[PDB]
Write a protein that binds this ligand. Sequence first.
Ligand SMILES: NC(=O)c1ccc[n+]([C@@H]2O[C@H](COP(=O)([O-])OP(=O)(O)OC[C@H]3O[C@@H](n4cnc5c(N)ncnc54)[C@H](OP(=O)(O)O)[C@@H]3O)[C@@H](O)[C@H]2O)c1
Ligand SMILES: NC(=O)c1ccc[n+]([C@@H]2O[C@H](COP(=O)([O-])OP(=O)(O)OC[C@H]3O[C@@H](n4cnc5c(N)ncnc54)[C@H](OP(=O)(O)O)[C@@H]3O)[C@@H](O)[C@H]2O)c1
Ligand SMILES: [Cl-]
Ligand SMILES: [Cl-]
Ligand SMILES: [Cl-]
Ligand SMILES: [Cl-]
Lengths: 231, 231
Amino acid sequence: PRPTILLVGASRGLGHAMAAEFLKRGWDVVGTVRADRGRTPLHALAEAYPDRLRIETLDITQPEQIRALAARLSGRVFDILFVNAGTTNPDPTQTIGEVSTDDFVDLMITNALSPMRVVETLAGLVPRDGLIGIMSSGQGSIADNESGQRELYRGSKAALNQFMRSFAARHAQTPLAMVLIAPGWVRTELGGPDARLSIDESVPGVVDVLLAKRGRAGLEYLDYRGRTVRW
Amino acid sequence: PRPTILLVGASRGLGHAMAAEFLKRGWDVVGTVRADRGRTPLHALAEAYPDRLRIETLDITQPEQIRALAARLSGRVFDILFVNAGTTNPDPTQTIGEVSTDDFVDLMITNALSPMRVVETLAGLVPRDGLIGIMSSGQGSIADNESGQRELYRGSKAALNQFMRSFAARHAQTPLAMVLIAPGWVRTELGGPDARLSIDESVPGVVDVLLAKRGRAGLEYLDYRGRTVRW
Ligand SMILES: NC(=O)c1ccc[n+]([C@@H]2O[C@H](COP(=O)([O-])OP(=O)(O)OC[C@H]3O[C@@H](n4cnc5c(N)ncnc54)[C@H](OP(=O)(O)O)[C@@H]3O)[C@@H](O)[C@H]2O)c1
Ligand SMILES: NC(=O)c1ccc[n+]([C@@H]2O[C@H](COP(=O)([O-])OP(=O)(O)OC[C@H]3O[C@@H](n4cnc5c(N)ncnc54)[C@H](OP(=O)(O)O)[C@@H]3O)[C@@H](O)[C@H]2O)c1
Ligand SMILES: [Cl-]
Ligand SMILES: [Cl-]
Ligand SMILES: [Cl-]
Ligand SMILES: [Cl-]
């Protein structure tokens, strides 16, 4: 009967840290990994929590795998669905006018289309008063984009946020809680060596925000400190 | 891709209906029939789901055929292995003191030894955190046996349940989920025309139980309503 989070993209980085943090707060976790990555930090974590962490497989860019996960989990209910999975393009220093079509397509599919297909397909596994979240980025804020850089990633997260606003409009005036999280610039393999925050300086706050967002209907764009991020 | 159940004994009755019900839930099914039985209701079901239901042959009382199936399914992974196959003796009104040695041996082999041999030999086709189930019966409960009748069948299912408890003990340090199902008294060729439940009143609940047991390690004895059955 323990509360359970379905955490999509939990193999490493922020997603793995989120799984560890929910487990420390007494929740169960179903976390997803991609089949191709071999053994991950999440596999090591599952050995420490053998009865409380379950690992499922999902590449979010494969719609058949999203449906397969939905079928596997159809006898389960999740208090929170959180889509952490995201990446960046091979060469983030390229401007939008320099990126290859393949790189543009790949990142828009991975970061914008695919998290939305996950939430649309798996929303039924969450109660109607539950919480659906996606890991966005402060870089997806258009109002805050005064400096550019990381051009393709920025557009992918801006598109994600807009898609999520339209999803939220279809749930207007219902109890569903929704959140786009900006975790801060964190020293993971994605954030890089110059990132301002350690994992432990971001993830407890993200988890605090998610727990507090439950029961507060509607979509918000919130950072790891609970501050509203401008669209 | 899609989750797959290996359903042993799916030709007729409850087993055939379970195949149909899993297909309705977005699962794929590999179902077994006895080769010498010619065409079965499962073959008709395969006409309607030719890409999602595959039929293999197996007489569970023939160890060489269990080994042959294991080789045939080499490299396949099944989220659920469920052994449905079972029968009863030619004259169920006979007391234990009346049954012939042949009838005793035949039923003990078919209902108790053989499902366990299937489970032991095919367990390697299921993940360490998968689900292995066997169709038992409420008649196999020793604590619930206040009224007798069906004497030989009752003993065969009690032995099955005990054998499965020992199998479960060997898996106590693993996340393997296991279930013995009591489906209720159902109007199949085995249950007879006087049985209380239609197939459709039992099978959706059995499948509900299986999908909800996936991910909950350890062995339980559960009926089609999810109630615990006393050993
Ligand atoms: N770190 C930061 O500074 C920062 C800032 C703002 C937002 N974010 C966001 O935070 C999230 C996690 O990033 P991170 O810093 O933890 O990066 P990370 O360490 O590189 O982890 C990325 C995670 O996403 C998964 N993933 C990527 N593509 C996937 C796909 N197709 N299907 C399934 N899973 C996939 C990865 O799985 P594999 O192991 O299989 O690759 C991994 O679990 C991303 O959405 C990112 O945009 C991060
Ligand atoms: N019906 C009830 O009221 C009831 C109640 C409690 C438990 N159960 C259990 O439910 C299961 C299914 O029974 P049912 O009512 O559906 O009976 P059924 O209609 O007579 O079907 C029995 C099934 O078992 C298969 N089977 C029997 N011996 C086999 C063997 N040696 N190798 C392979 N398959 C074999 C049959 O295949 P063939 O077509 O080749 O014969 C058929 O698919 C049994 O385990 C039974 O004990 C039934
Ligand atoms: Cl992942
Ligand atoms: Cl951020
Ligand atoms: Cl059969
Ligand atoms: Cl029963």
